[PDB]
Design an enzyme around this catalytic site. Structure first.
Site, PDB file in Angstrom:
ATOM      1  N   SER A  12      45.118  42.320  22.524  1.00  0.00           N
ATOM      2  CA  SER A  12      45.194  43.237  23.627  1.00  0.00           C
ATOM      3  C   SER A  12      46.582  43.253  24.199  1.00  0.00           C
ATOM      4  O   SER A  12      47.402  42.502  23.807  1.00  0.00           O
ATOM      5  CB  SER A  12      44.176  42.921  24.674  1.00  0.00           C
ATOM      6  OG  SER A  12      44.550  41.834  25.410  1.00  0.00           O
ATOM      7  N   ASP A  30      44.184  46.262  20.728  1.00  0.00           N
ATOM      8  CA  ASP A  30      43.182  46.740  21.643  1.00  0.00           C
ATOM      9  C   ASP A  30      43.698  47.820  22.560  1.00  0.00           C
ATOM     10  O   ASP A  30      44.766  48.273  22.382  1.00  0.00           O
ATOM     11  CB  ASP A  30      42.708  45.543  22.454  1.00  0.00           C
ATOM     12  CG  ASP A  30      41.272  45.576  22.777  1.00  0.00           C
ATOM     13  OD1 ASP A  30      40.645  46.484  22.321  1.00  0.00           O
ATOM     14  OD2 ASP A  30      40.821  44.786  23.566  1.00  0.00           O
ATOM     15  N   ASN A  46      33.269  44.727  19.881  1.00  0.00           N
ATOM     16  CA  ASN A  46      34.295  43.886  20.485  1.00  0.00           C
ATOM     17  C   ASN A  46      33.651  42.741  21.253  1.00  0.00           C
ATOM     18  O   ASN A  46      32.577  42.897  21.842  1.00  0.00           O
ATOM     19  CB  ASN A  46      35.187  44.710  21.428  1.00  0.00           C
ATOM     20  CG  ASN A  46      35.974  45.837  20.710  1.00  0.00           C
ATOM     21  OD1 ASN A  46      35.621  46.281  19.603  1.00  0.00           O
ATOM     22  ND2 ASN A  46      37.034  46.316  21.369  1.00  0.00           N
ATOM     23  N   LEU A  47      34.324  41.583  21.271  1.00  0.00           N
ATOM     24  CA  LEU A  47      33.772  40.389  21.914  1.00  0.00           C
ATOM     25  C   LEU A  47      34.634  39.862  23.055  1.00  0.00           C
ATOM     26  O   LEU A  47      34.185  39.880  24.210  1.00  0.00           O
ATOM     27  CB  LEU A  47      33.521  39.302  20.869  1.00  0.00           C
ATOM     28  CG  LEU A  47      32.340  39.578  19.942  1.00  0.00           C
ATOM     29  CD1 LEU A  47      31.736  38.276  19.437  1.00  0.00           C
ATOM     30  CD2 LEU A  47      31.315  40.384  20.687  1.00  0.00           C
TER      31      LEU A  47
END
Ligand SMILES: [Zn+2]
Ligand SMILES: [Zn+2]
Lengths: 336, 337
Positions: free
Chosen positions: A60, A107, A264-265
């Site tokens: 991200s 991300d 996504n986690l």
């Protein structure tokens, strides 16, 4: 049975599409794990190899900057760009050792973070020139705050430049007009991008907050698209699941039934990764310089208990198991 | 004022020798920090940049394997090889950002571990052919437990390979034959390696165990022995390295530097410091359970703001860099750029 499933390391171009088509027709999603360090990518690559599965590793904007270091000034995105590039090389270099295919992705990137995007594409193109593949497998745009015209328009703009390297683009659309995402809205995204390249996925708004989750809506997108396109394919779109932690096994099931290939986690793993290191608070009596509760009261050496190679590994093992849970819940375990 | 003092990123070739000669001429040494993660190389680079200092990052055999991941089988040195290479790319990729010259080194390689050495050296060469540069700046051979004519023998053969690449070799000799190491034995090493290339450095047994007391003065003896049997004018014909000497006094460090030590290794101290800041995240143990925080509300208020690894891992970085900053003051390398 596509080549992808026998490959090892980071994959690009047609291998990414083949893997996502394989997921849709064999009915599994691939977890996408946000990473912030060599340790956390090790945790994910391990959980993945052990359950014989493909994995998606993403960075991200903030995780990329962590790879750079929080002390690196990021007003200009210099850290997210350097960090993401640094993590790309690290992941490329180590991923083959675990012997699975790895999709390398970034991300959420909103309109104010587009310079982070631009820097990666530069590095990508540069890397593509020297080597025949980009650095990253995949990149994401999240202009879901903009109106959908602007959102689709500038995604197409980047996508056209991305398609020259076969790169994958993930796009998000919400509910901005000029509530959930209408299937018409999602098909409009497909119309413009599929004119450029089929290597794109869509993350829609279906209650997946990041009042509740209507995963049955993603089928409506797929079905709407079927009709419009005039195709037999059950899954004309590639779909992504954002805000995945807390949804039941049944919800993930219809989502995967509806063409979702990636879930996504992040913050689940985040917590997981912490547990193992948190639970090392049983040893705070052995976690001072020489003072040990055990033998030799203050003359014992605590090296063996403070080596980060010892306690960080606890975090890796605990994060990995959380990931393995997912790999099973998503039916991805054992697909290689 | 050599060009290295204004460079950013992993330096190679002459820059390394250039850095060491300035270290000898200005009389400072350079801490070599063992690293095991991106998190740990960040801690070291950040300390170097903040204290305007050059720095050496190295990877021990088990450090490399850790970079590769402890779940990877190392029985054929397979994890240390991959892990050292993956750490090399990441360090090379991130070092320029910190605006600092960095030496990318590898720690103690004994005879039993030379697969690792060959694995790292093959990849250095593949990379040299493609870029004009190896991955690592230097490598260490530690064949001190073998007889000294065999220790120096294999080093020379490897150094001959490495010298094509301008790559730096660091060698360790002990007390065996074929108590402290003599000047006579040390000059033997210099006798052989100096044929191949200047770019090498010696670590000798002078009581720095890693009984005998620690005697940095012997390092002067090596210098003045080699000095005479060369016949030159310069104070330091040898590049010397201080292993396992944490907790030595500032005076003991100062006499070792003035005898031409340019590199002091640090490992466990940084380890303890790294842990320190993360352990001090005891404190928020009550915030360290999934969602219910004993503070505001037991369900209603969440903890992800405290369990984010970007928060607490950073605390370990900050305390690790603090330990490294003291080292740069103690070794006088602070502010040398
Ligand atoms: Zn989203
Ligand atoms: Zn040694």
């Amino acid at each position: 049975p596509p080549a992808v499933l026998s490959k090892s390391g980071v994959i690009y171009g047609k291998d990414v599409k083949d893997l996502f088509d394989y997921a849709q027709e064999k009915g599994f999603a691939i977890p996408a794990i946000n990473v912030t360090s060599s340790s956390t990518v090790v945790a994910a690559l391990e959980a993945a190899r052990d359950n014989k599965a493909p994995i998606i590793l993403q960075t991200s904007q903030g995780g990329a900057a962590y790879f750079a270091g929080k002390g690196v000034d990021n007003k200009d995105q210099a850290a997210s760009i350097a960090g993401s590039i640094a993590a790309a090389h690290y992941i490329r270099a180590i991923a083959p050792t675990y012997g699975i295919p790895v999709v390398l992705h970034t991300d959420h990137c909103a309109k104010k973070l587009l310079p982070w995007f631009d820097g990666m594409l530069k590095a990508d193109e540069e890397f593509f020139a020297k080597t025949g593949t980009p650095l990253f497998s995949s990149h994401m745009l999240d202009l879901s705050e903009e109106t959908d015209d602007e959102n689709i328009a500038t995604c197409a703009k980047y996508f056209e430049r991305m398609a020259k390297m076969g790169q994958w683009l993930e796009m998000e659309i919400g509910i901005t007009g000029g509530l959930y995402t209408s299937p018409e809205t999602v098909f409009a995204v497909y119309e413009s991008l599929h004119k450029i390249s089929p290597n794109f996925s869509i993350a829609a708004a279906f209650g997946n907050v990041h009042v509740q989750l209507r995963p049955e809506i993603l089928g409506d997108h797929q079905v709407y698209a079927k009709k419009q396109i005039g195709t037999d394919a059950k899954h004309p779109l590639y779909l992504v699941f954002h805000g995945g932690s807390g949804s039941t096994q049944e919800e993930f099931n219809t989502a995967i039934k509806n063409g979702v290939v990636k879930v996504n986690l992040d913050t689940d793993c985040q917590y997981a990764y912490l547990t193992g290191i948190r639970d090392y608070v049983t040893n705070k009596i052995e976690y001072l310089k020489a003072p040990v509760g055990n033998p030799e009261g203050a003359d014992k050496p605590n090296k063996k208990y403070f080596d980060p190679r010892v306690w960080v590994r606890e975090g890796e093992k605990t994060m990995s198991k959380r990931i393995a849970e997912a790999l099973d819940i998503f039916h991805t375990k054992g697909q290689l």
